[PDB]
Amino acid sequence: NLNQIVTDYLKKKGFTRKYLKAFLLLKNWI
Amino acid sequence: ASLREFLNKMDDYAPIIPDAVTNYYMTRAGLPPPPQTDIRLARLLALATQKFIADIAADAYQYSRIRASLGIQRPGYGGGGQGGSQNRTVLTMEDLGMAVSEFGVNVKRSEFYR
Amino acid sequence: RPRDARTLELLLTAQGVTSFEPRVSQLLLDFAYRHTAAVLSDALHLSSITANAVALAISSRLGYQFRGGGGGYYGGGGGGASKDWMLELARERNKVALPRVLPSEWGVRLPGERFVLSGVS
Amino acid sequence: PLKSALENEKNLKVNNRKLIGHSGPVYGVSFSDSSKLLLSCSADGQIRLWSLEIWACLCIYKAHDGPVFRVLWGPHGHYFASAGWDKTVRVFTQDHASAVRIMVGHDTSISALAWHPNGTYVFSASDEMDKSIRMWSVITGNCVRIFTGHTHYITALECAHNGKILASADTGGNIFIWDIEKGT
Amino acid sequence: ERRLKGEVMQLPARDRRRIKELAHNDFDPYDALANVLMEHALKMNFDLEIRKRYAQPLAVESGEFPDTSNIESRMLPFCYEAGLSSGHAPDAAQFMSIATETFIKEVMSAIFSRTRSNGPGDSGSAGFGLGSGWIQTHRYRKQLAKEEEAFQRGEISRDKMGLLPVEAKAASERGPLGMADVRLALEMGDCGLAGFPVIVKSVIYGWREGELENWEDYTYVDPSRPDGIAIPSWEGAEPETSDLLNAVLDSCLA
Amino acid sequence: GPKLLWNPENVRDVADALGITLSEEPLRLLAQDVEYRIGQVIVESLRFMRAANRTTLTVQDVSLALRVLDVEPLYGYESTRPLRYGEASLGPGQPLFYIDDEEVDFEKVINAPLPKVPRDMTFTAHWLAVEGVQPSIPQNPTTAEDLLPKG
Amino acid sequence: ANWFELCQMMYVSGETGEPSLETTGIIEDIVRQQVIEIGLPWEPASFYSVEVPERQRLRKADERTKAMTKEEYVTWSEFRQASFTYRKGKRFREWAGFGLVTDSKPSDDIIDILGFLTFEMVQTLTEEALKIKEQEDLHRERLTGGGGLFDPPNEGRTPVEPRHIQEAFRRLQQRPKKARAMLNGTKLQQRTQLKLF
Amino acid sequence: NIGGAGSGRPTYTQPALPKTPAFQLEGEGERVLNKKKLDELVRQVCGGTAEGQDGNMLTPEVEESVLNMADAFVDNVLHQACRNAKERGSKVLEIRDIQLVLERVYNIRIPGYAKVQPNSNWIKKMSAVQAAKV
Amino acid sequence: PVFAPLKRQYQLARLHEQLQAATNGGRTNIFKVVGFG
Amino acid sequence: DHMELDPKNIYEVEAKILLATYPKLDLEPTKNAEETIAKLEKLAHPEHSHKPPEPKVRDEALAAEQERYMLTLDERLSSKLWEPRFERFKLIENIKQEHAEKKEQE
Amino acid sequence: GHFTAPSSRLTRRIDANIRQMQETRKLCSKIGVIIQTHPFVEADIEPHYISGEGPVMAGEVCRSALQRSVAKIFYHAGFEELQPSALDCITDIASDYFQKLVRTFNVYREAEKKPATGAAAERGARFVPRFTPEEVILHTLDENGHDIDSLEAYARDEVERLGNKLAQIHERMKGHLADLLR
């Protein structure tokens, strides 16, 4: 079972439990 | 001989290979066509190819002639028909294989596939 | 249609290929013939020839070609390099910091003058 | 008609052009983030950076050994990644002539690529015995996820725009949907 | 699908039986990988002389080109491994050394021919004689012909090594062989390294020559330029004692 | 040993061509090795074919597969002429096949007419579906000839 | 065998010293290997079914000839007749293994051709080895007062060594690039047969 | 000195006439000749070097590659040759095996150290095929 | 086969031999710890 | 079963281990180059922020000669002009222990 | 004329040699009787239009033209009959050689630059190309077994010499036939 192997390995490793932009935008919207 | 004079005189050394073939294979190998690449260079490369092929053909003919006058063709070069017509020299596979084996190529085949 | 030529066709068909090109099976047959001839000549020169001679000839041949195939875990495919050596190289390369870039150069820079195609006309 | 920045070609009338210079079959192309740059990879083992303003090559990258099958710009257009025959993925930046990161861990050839929409993770897939997907970290170059379950050749990959979904397809007609965070 | 039946049945029955026999194969346990994984993870004691192979340093470790002594030292462990109890012939070390020298000379000659030009002439005592030489440019060829003609009249004399002034002048410019030349020469052919993939891969995967030094030299994209390129012209806690520990370790390693 | 798809009789024929006599064990070993090599070549060729978004195995793919494996190239297999197989008969139940090949004169070859030049590459456009419905125009396929669940 | 013919041929070609026995053995091995390894039909006239009837070496040689004495001239002329197969048919055929590799007793024209070829090989080998040795000495260049009773007058001249012969042989075996032009861009090992220099 | 106990041990302990060891009174020494060997080879194959310069013909990164080449070549050749020799029933290594390996795998020929025909079945098959062809 | 540089193999062999010597064939554990440091 | 882990499950085991090790990842899309640059700068790692390496680089004589001359024909000391391991002693101890243990039975 | 051999001094004298060989063969056949052929004509293609400006990419037509040229050269080498497989093999080899040559040219033309020295460094330039346009072409020819002199000789002398020899042989054949008839 994979779970048992994973648990064993994990235990063995000690795993504890600025304004120009707005201007251009406004012009493009206008 | 000089590169400059040879390139200038290239007008008198145009090979027999058409321009379409040269453009096709130059583009396949990664070189644009003559309009962007001096036509002299394309002609020079085609001339080199022609020289190589001519040398191979000469070697093949030399190999063929000696064989003309035990008496069994070498294994591995299956190819041919009835044997041609008249006493004409025929470009068979054995001569071509023996000739090109000098250039590093190998053209062995099988005769009876079973 | 010779034999083994109707069998290679079926083998390829049974693996997805929905089309073909005549003279492909001919190419495969000729390749098999040439490989057999080369291996047999090498074995004959090595040593009646035993199985040890054939094994030695194949082992010697494998030294400089056929370094591919679909090998999986620790199978010498895709070049034949060992995974540990590649991990060492990756560790060495993945140590340096990523290059620093500024928004004014994000998309317009290029490598040094020595590694560019400048003036090749 | 297409336009060229070279004065000698002022107002030339053509609507299709050619880019020559590869010496083998071409397997990938990626338009940049209009677009002014293009990438391409072929079977000779080279990656080329073209220009869509003068229509000529600018650089060549020679970090591969064997065919290159895929290439991809980044989501924003400064980084690109390439994978090929030698079972390794590399991440380049156009400012440098060498790979800045090398990513080992696959067991067979690569057959797909993708980028995370935030431009710091990369996906890849392999064929043959090892049909698994992986997710690398651009900062460290270490895998952080593996997805298994495919049984056929994987042909495509795609990452959702929100950034929490991944879709992959194979030659059996199956499409999978993966949860990146939970790997399920 | 209909034509599939006909295609299948076109074969003889014996071939069909041979094909159908495949189902009895015992699949792919690939247990042969066990030895590979293990490797990667009265009487004479033949195992005490094989272990001596690692005692002698390699050529790269020391910097000495292998000679008869090193090869002689290396021979015996291989023989004992393969089962040759008797040993090796007395005069094998010299043969092996000569073969190694010839191989290295051939490889180096292959690399040099594809990246150098204007080599020493063939007047006498120099050049390549009956071997394969380098190319010659027009101007250098003209000057060499003129100098060779002149030297017959006694006007000019050779240098200490037998090179005429033009040849010595040309040889002055050439610099040492680098890695760019090796990389370029490996694109043309194999250079005799068809059996050493590790060397070629190491060459390919290394840094580009002259990149670490010029790590911050860049160009820019600018279509106005001719080519689109614009060239710019607890005890002892580590977080506090780390420096001292590093210094002592550096002194220890030396 | 295992079961071999390659018939050892071909190995026997090749050995006979070289004047060599083989026992059963070396014959089996050689046949198995040749089978493995053919498998490797097929794997590489299919890899190259799939890399180009196709389901049609051509000769260029096999040539590339041979190139990556460091094998000597095979020349002359691109010819556009048809492939015709002859049929000899060694004896009852042992037919043999050969490649039909008839000699020709250089006149007939050099004087032949060139094939037709295919037109240039071009592209067009049309509407495959509008709001989920396929218009019945000439470009779209006819309704006469798998596109709807029925569970 | 043939040691003395080798010595005479070396003397003719510019080796006035006294080469040791190893040089002779190596040269004999090379020549034996080459020999064992070993208008016109293909001329333009052969294109038709029926035929119809018709109708720096020199400079050095001259300098040496001008720069030798009468006794040296006599010795040089006498050595010039040295041959491998001049009135030695049986000995050469035994030393060439004719029977084991071909039908025995060919014509004597073949023997004359073989002698000519062998003379040419020895000439070329000596001429190249001399240059190699001279270059080695020239690069290398850049304590007993009183005197004895058997001391040489001036010495200074030494013969060639086996290593020089080996280097010359390696130099002679190289082929033109036209035999490799078909392996460009690939990693294929080149393999060929012995080159008949 | 045979026996394997070792020589030169200053402890408590013979043939009639033992062989003298090897010694050199004064000279360059092997530590210099071995290092100069590579530059000598480069000079040999480079064509020649002008006065006032020598030695620095290979950059530091290429000498390491050359040395690795040499070591790998030696190891591979010896490993192949020993097995090849043991194959044919021999119990000692002779120059013939090394020469065979070098000739047939590397195209190297070192001087101065000392066929195939078809059988009847192939001829019969060729005759049958040719007869069927006509 | 699988390929890798010679240097790595030689260094690994030397290290393994030295460790086998030091640990006396695995009969002695030189990595044990007594106390709490 | 025999072996503690058959190869075919290696990929699944590694996937689960990696899932356990890295439970949380950054999966927030950006919108322009500046955001990506900022994210790259923020996430830098101490262990992967080094610098590129540096290019690889390459009167008493009479006394030394006298010493070398005086050390002529010395079998062992000449070569040197030493890492003891006590292998023979350990072999002797092992064999003695084996012999004593065997004698225990008899 | 795109798919036909150019016009120059080399294709001429080659057509001439082939025609002279055919005529002499006819005379020899007449002598033997005491058979007939027709001149080689290179075909062409119907008018073709191409968008933009680029090479005409058609594999079959180009391969057939190359095969025609190879057959012409092989016949000029003194052949009368052939086998299809041999022609296919030589055609494939020729195409591969062409591609190798062009790839070598491109490999040399775009190599990594080198540091400048001497007057180049004095002017301030740092890097200069490591192969000048002359050396690029010289290396391209050398790596494939060629030289300027060999190509010049092949283009200028061999064809002329063969033509002269063929003319002499034809004159001798005519004289012999006339004398035999008398």
Side-chain angles (χ1 to χ4, degrees), chain A residues 1-3 5-6 8-10 15 21, chain J residues 4-5 9 12-13 16-17 20-21 34:
Chain A
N1 213 302
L2 317 183
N3 276 335
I5 304 162
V6 172
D8 289 21
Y9 170 89
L10 289 158
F15 263 84
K21 195 196 305 198
Chain J
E4 205 202 314
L5 177 61
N9 304 341
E12 311 201 77
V13 176
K16 272 168 171 168
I17 289 153
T21 311
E34 299 181 314

Side-chain angles (χ1 to χ4, degrees), chain D residues 127-157:
Chain D
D127 63 354
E128 204 73 358
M129 303 287 203
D130 169 10
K131 298 177 185 99
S132 63
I133 305 174
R134 299 204 182 211
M135 171 175 186
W136 315 89
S137 175
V138 164
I139 293 278
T140 74
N142 277 335
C143 184
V144 310
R145 286 292 192 285
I146 296 176
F147 314 86
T148 44
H150 269 281
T151 56
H152 295 66
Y153 195 75
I154 306 165
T155 49
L157 277 167

